[PDB]
Amino acid sequence: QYPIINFTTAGATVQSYTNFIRAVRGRLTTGADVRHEIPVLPNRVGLPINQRFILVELSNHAELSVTLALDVTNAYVVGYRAGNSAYFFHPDNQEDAEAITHLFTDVQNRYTFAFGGNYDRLEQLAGNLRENIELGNGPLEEAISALYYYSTGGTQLPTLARSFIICIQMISEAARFQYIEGEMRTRIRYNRRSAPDPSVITLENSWGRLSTAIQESNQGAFASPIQLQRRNGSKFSVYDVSILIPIIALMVYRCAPPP
Ligand SMILES: O=C(O)[C@H]1O[C@@H](Oc2cc3oc(-c4ccccc4)cc(=O)c3c(O)c2O)[C@H](O)[C@@H](O)[C@@H]1O
């Protein structure tokens, strides 16, 4: 009953990846709140649970398929299905736990992780930092096999964690930022994998702050600048929503929009 977007990594191109991410955004929004030309995700409060999630079915060159569940309120992966098993990140508010019981209700085996989905938990689990984990079509292809074979006991947990990190960044963060989508399109266009540079990681770390600064801004103007980093790690200050318009595609809801 939840909407499904399909994507295959095998023979993926800039175009098929672009179409996939646009379709993902399309399902996450309307939610027709746009603040400064930037769509805001639905406020979870008052959100009917039938509208809470979307499903992203990934398949790969090995003909393996896993379906991820994304929370439409933050674009984030809450868990996934592989065959007859479903796995969920440990929630952290009883409304979440409530919400996820409506996911993958037909599956035989449903497990909840001890851990949550945040990069901090995941990075230690993987024994690697985001900056040391390659992204690209290759890593995503492998991530899909890893996620699938976990449902059968053939995947070590640190490989799993690494797989979540790859997926979350190439789907959730890409839906959130045209800039990160751009970074992944480029890796795909040249079939090169590489770890995310500091510009990517700082965007990811600052998504909440960015959303708040934009929705609280005075006519687009930030009362206080936000520091981001360039590709080479040198820092720069954002003072205004204008420069973020071609960077950020979705925002998490923060308060009502002022009339
Ligand atoms: O940006 C901040 O200053 C602080 O914001 C906090 O996060 C939120 C802030 C928020 O601030 C506002 C807000 C702020 C000023 C005026 C009107 C509204 C509304 C929110 O819905 C909101 C929210 O949902 C947050 O999660 C964080 O919990 C907190 O860590 C952070 O310090």
Ligand 1: distance of its center to the CA of 254 in Å? 7
Q: Known catalytic residue: 209?
A: no
Amino acid, single-letter form, for residue 219? Q
Q: What CATH code would you report for 1-175?
A: 3.40.420.10
Q: Known catalytic residue: 176?
A: yes
Ligand 1: distance of its center to the CA of 43 in Å? 14
CB burial of 16-41 (b: ≥16 within 10 Å; e: otherwise) equals ebbebbebbbebbbebebebbebbbb
Ligand 1: distance of its center to the CA of 130 in Å? 26
Tell me which of 2, 149, 173, 183 is the catalytic residue: 173
Residues 202, 164, 58, 251, CA torsion sign: negative
Measure the CA angle with vertex 15, ends 11 and 17; round to 5°. 70
Residues in a beta bridge with 240: 221
The minimum-distance atom of ligand 1 relative to the CA of 213 is 1
Q: How far apart are the first and last CA of the chain?
A: 35
Q: Where in the chain is the domain with CATH 3.40.420.10?
A: 1-175
Helix (H, G, I), strand (E, B) or coil at 98: helix
Angle, helices 178-189/198-205, rounded to nearest 10 degrees: 150
Q: What CATH code would you report for 176-259?
A: 4.10.470.10
Tokens of 215: 């929705």
Q: Known catalytic residue: 76?
A: yes
Q: Where in the chain is the domain with CATH 4.10.470.10?
A: 176-259
Q: How far is CA 129 from CA 47, 85, 186, 224, in A?
A: 34, 28, 22, 29
Residues 193, 137, 84, 152, CA torsion sign: negative
**CA gap 222, 206 in Å, rounded:** 14
Experimental method: X-ray
Does ligand 1 lie within 6 Å of residue 209's CB atom?
Answer: yes
